[PDB]
Amino acid sequence: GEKSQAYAEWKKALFQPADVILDPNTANPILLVSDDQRSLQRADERQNLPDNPERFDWHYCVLGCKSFTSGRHYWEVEVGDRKEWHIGVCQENVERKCWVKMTPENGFWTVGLTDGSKYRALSDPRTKLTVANPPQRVGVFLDYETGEVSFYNAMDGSHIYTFPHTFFSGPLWPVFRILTLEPTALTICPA
């Protein structure tokens, strides 16, 4: 209650609430972006889509519709009871076609879940997270100037992970990744 309230007030003191919608033109051909562009699901197989340059052809990734070149931004994602997901930010210049490892070195700052219970930061090497209360809703917090990407349990204000401070190159995009075919979608919370 107090921890929720402190979490709400910290977001207001410091971070601009981003209104994030998914760009279907970036989505891997196995992903479905909802008609309202807030939700993501996976298909049984690749659907037939143009291989336009911005689309992720290998990684099961999709980007937001707007980038960040400066400032403090947050958005929250309802991951619900999904067994698998990764979210965060990536540089505009990430490899979209060939495989690259999703690491900060390759322009990806993401954390997530595998096999229902394995929380990880996709640092290199990967960081094993210990999470006492598994989140249904995750806040993604960006500070462009200080090279800061951090993640919170948006329901109880508990911290999940902060990447080492870095230097970003060029615009950052919200990025979302699902590998599994399971009943719960990934849904962005509007601003």
Author numbering: 323 to 513
Provide text from the study.
Herrmann's group and our team have recently confirmed that alpaca Vγ9Vδ2 T cells are activated by pAg-binding VpBTN3 (18, 20). The electrostatic surface of the apo-form VpBTN3 B30.2 ΔC structure shows that the pAg-binding site is a positively charged pocket comprising residue W421 and six basic residues (H381, H408, K423, R442, R448, and R499), making it more suitable for binding the negatively charged pyrophosphate group of pAgs.
Consistent with the results obtained with human BTN3A1 B30.2 domain, HMBPP-08 binds to VpBTN3 B30.2 ΔC domain with higher affinity than HMBPP (KD = 55.7 nM for HMBPP-08, KD = 1.27 μM for HMBPP). Clear electron density maps of HMBPP-08 can only be observed in chain B. HMBPP-08 binds to a positively charged pocket formed by basic residues (H381, R421, R442, and R448), aromatic residues (W380, Y382, and W421), and a hydrophobic residue (L501). The pyrophosphate group of HMBPP-08 forms hydrogen bonds with the side chain of residues R442, R448, R499, W421 and the main chain N of M424 via a bridging water molecule. Meanwhile, the OH group of HMBPP-08 forms hydrogen bonds with the imidazole group of H381 and the main chain N of Y382. Furthermore, the methylphenyl group of HMBPP-08 forms hydrophobic interactions with residues Y382 and L501. Unexpectedly, HMBPP-08 did not promote the binding between B30.2 domains of VpBTN2 and VpBTN3, even with its robust affinity for the VpBTN3 B30.2 ΔC domain. Aligning VpBNT3/HMBPP-08 and VpBTN2-DMASPP-VpBTN3 B30.2 structure indicate that the bulky methylphenyl moiety of HMBPP-08 would clash with the loop region consisting of residues 505 to 507 of VpBTN2 B30.2 domain, which prevents HMBPP-08 from associating the VpBTN2 B30.2 domain to the VpBTN3 B30.2 domain.
